[PDB]
Amino acid sequence: HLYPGEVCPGMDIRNNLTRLHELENCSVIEGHLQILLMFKTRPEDFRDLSFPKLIMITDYLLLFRVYGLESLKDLFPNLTVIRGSRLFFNYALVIFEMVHLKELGLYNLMNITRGSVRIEKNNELCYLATIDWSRILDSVEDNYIVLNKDDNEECGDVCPGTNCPATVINGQFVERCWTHSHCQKVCPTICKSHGCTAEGLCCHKECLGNCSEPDDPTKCVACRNFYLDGQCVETCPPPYYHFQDWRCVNFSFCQDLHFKCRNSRCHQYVIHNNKCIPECPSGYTMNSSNLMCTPCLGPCPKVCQILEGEKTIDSVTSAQELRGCTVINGSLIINIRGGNNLAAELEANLGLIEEISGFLKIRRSYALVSLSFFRKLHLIRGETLEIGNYSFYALDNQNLRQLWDWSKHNLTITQGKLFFHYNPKLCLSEIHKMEEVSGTKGRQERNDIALKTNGDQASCENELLKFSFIRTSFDKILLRWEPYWPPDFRDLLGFMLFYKEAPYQNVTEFSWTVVDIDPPQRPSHPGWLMRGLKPWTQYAIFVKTLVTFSDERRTYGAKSDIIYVQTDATNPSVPLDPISVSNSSSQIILKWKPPSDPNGNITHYLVYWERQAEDSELFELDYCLKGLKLPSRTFEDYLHNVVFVPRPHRPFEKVVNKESLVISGLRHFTGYRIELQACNQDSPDERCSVAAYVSARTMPEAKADDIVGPVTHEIFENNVVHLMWQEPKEPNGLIVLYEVSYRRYGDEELHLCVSRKHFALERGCRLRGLSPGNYSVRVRATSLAGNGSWTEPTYFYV
């Protein structure tokens, strides 16, 4: 679609809304919109003010201390895409110190071409976590949304679900909503940026964000590449040159813009490569008649002067003003106080420069891994040296690893002295390589290059050590490495051995238990032994060299490659979780868990079971005397040390791959003694753990306690009756007593005891004082299980 409205150059609004009227007809803004410093405003002043014409912003949007504003939905309802050609401190949209603001309300905003978004210090702002920036920003790692209401409180969010698509942020699906009334429009994943209509039909290839009629360059709300006469096109057709990377203009427009600057105070535009570029790059000069600049037959660079010869680089917008420069008549200090990497943009903006008249300084740049972005840096004249007569400066760079790639790069420093300090990951080898390649060897004095601070957390030993002997054992590992000797033997002060357990092969370089080894006395391989090492565990071990300052010399120590050695196996630990339950009178279930310390791959388990011998006292005790509650069930070493001195069959089975055991062929209701062992080695002199003891007794049967056989009686002349019944010689364990329940016909019933010794010695039981009549006797045997079935009534006459 077309853009009904003017180019409307980016403006600034301050202290009152009198200048908002200037946007009444603005459909596109060719610059930056900064609305800020609105102190005396009430919420009633913004309800009736709206700008539906505005669609796309080129540079950025700044909102800073606008009092009385609660939502931007009434301000820019049709803001779709922000190109971000020029950022505001590497941020394409900043909402800083906004009071009374509750929700953003930019429901129609789809893409942000370049830059990030920083929203900070707004204590009343909600609906922040409910926006999926991934579909909005192609890179969200540089966003900064902190010190707000959402992360300091728990204000509610109203999602228009019942509709609004839900997207997963880390591990759960959440609703994406701008306000309670409008929510984040999501297009199908097939069309990443061309935009979608309401029904899902994909827009034209040149469409961006939103469109009315799908697959039509004339119906694109926002042009993806360029704009011309309401037609988004891949490139500007001839003879229309490109302009500001978003539209195409004819020669008349560029000519008029150039001529308006000559008779005024500016950006006098020229023409190059079918574009209306402000100033074409180095080596080109623009003629008198036409506006095309031609390549000069000489070395004419584009020099970029500096305000008082001191420019600091801290952001993308601070370096983009150096785009296209080749020679700098000033000194650059690089200070990216960040925490995130910016080498990608810094490579594009910087890197085309060759000479630096002033000095170069790096200070506090936290995220600078390397200075490789200076792609074309060759010479540093250092005419205006930094204080202290310094031409190169590097101080407190927490991640500076390599200055350049000296193998393929070249450099030349004319004057000044170097300076390096507090670079914890830039070791001295790189500094020395630079001081050799540049040609400033005889220029620095003492303490110009710090030795302790530079690369103290790094490791560039660049020399190899080899282990001449590796031996493992039960708990001890013996190591020896070949001797190392720098040019001065006094430099070496010892070897530091790092060893750390690592079950997996993949181990990084540089936890890590450290052991100090004294230097060998000057064959004489230093060596060391480790003790207290758990068996059957892989270990990653390497050795490091400790040397002196090496300022006059160039000794960088040595290190050995990481070695993976595993200690051997041994006897395993005690098997764990032993339980012994009986599910059947002949079956016992056994459950046990593997020991805590396998100390080797367990091969098989060993278990032994046997029958205990019952208590003797159980057989010679009286079981009806009250209290009858039956329980329910070196000189050699001394001489050698002094003389020698160093110069200066129970049933069992092999249970394999099984933790649950059931045992058959067992006597019912009889205890058994079970000892269990674990074995991690079977054939070569089988190695097993200590015995784990457990005991269990099977549950009793139902017929063992019942007495079998009829009842036999004998009667003397005095009506004294001896009664006989054969005992169940195979009871539930054993029978402790018998009960004689005899009754007189029509009279009361009496009871009498038959103990074990009473039955055995008295050849049974003998009842005394039994009157003539018809008696009835039922006999019960009390075993260790319980009560048996009573015998049939004993009918007899005396």
Binding site: K466, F467, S468, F469, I470
Partner: peptide, 21 residues
């Protein structure tokens, strides 16, 4: 040499067989 293969580094039976007569 044999040490540079089996002492400093690891070996297997196949290349250990090369040292028999």
């Amino acid at each position: 040499g044999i040490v540079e293969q089996c002492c400093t580094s690891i070996c297997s039976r196949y290349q250990l067989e090369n040292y028999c007569n």
